[PDB]
DNA sequence: AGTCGACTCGCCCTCTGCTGGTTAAAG
DNA sequence: CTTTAACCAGCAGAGGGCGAGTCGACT
């Protein structure tokens, strides 16, 4: 109460310390769940993971219809009424509604060597990771009725196929 | 008393991934 | 001009790490 052994301390309490140990040290996770094999140092922690199952949203923007998990999410929002931009890229100044954003942007717009994604299926490479899924879907995910060809009666189940066969046409 | 350890309530950060407007090239 | 799909900010999903304030419990 408080000094730390294995770090640098960040006194003082004596869970304050404890409760540090637990978490950056010695991994203890007392409390688990129901269905998953998850379990964490906090039983707030586990309360607010049990809503991932169950579903329940006790959170609501009186200014709309949105509900969230827990507290932060909601002042997140609250964000989008407010229109408050509380995060700045140092470099263009331009601003944003949430760190993450801005941190994409950073990535996407003054970084260099950044890694890209080729599809496994085409050949193509695309930045972000998200929009490599969403081209997975529009171009590689599997159509039930199928599509037929344009100027053959050749029918296809995914998009990238019939695109690609409507050649020489 | 005086010190816990256990209980609880609250602040703020990170990583992840989908959605829809824009834009620019290819039909 | 239309059609298309990557680019992009916006925005919501789950989880981690800390501060700090009540008490009954035990020396
Ligand atoms: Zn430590
Ligand atoms: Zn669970
Ligand atoms: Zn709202
Ligand atoms: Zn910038
Ligand atoms: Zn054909």
């Given at each position: 109460p408080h000094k730390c052994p294995d770090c640098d301390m960040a006194f003082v309490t004596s869970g304050e310390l404890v409760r540090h140990r637990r978490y950056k040290?010695?991994?203890?996770?007392?409390f688990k769940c129901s269905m998953c094999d998850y379990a964490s140092v906090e039983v707030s922690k586990l309360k607010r993971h049990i809503r991932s199952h169950?579903?329940?949203?006790?959170?609501?923007c009186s200014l709309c219809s949105y509900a969230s998990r827990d507290t932060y999410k909601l002042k997140r929002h609250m964000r989008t009424h407010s229109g408050?931009?509380?995060?700045?890229?140092?470099?263009?100044?331009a601003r944003f509604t949430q760190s993450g954003t801005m941190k994409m942007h950073i990535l996407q717009?003054?970084?260099?060597?950044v890694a890209k994604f080729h599809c496994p299926h085409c050949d193509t490479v695309i930045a972000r990771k998200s929009d490599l899924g969403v081209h997975l879907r529009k171009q590689?995910?599997?159509?039930?009725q199928g599509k037929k060809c344009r100027y053959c009666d050749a029918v296809f189940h995914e998009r990238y196929a019939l695109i690609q066969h409507q050649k020489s046409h």
């Open positions: 040290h010695t991994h203890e996770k007392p169950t579903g329940e949203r006790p959170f609501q408050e931009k509380p995060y700045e890229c140092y470099i263009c100044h717009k003054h970084t260099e060597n590689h995910s599997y159509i039930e």
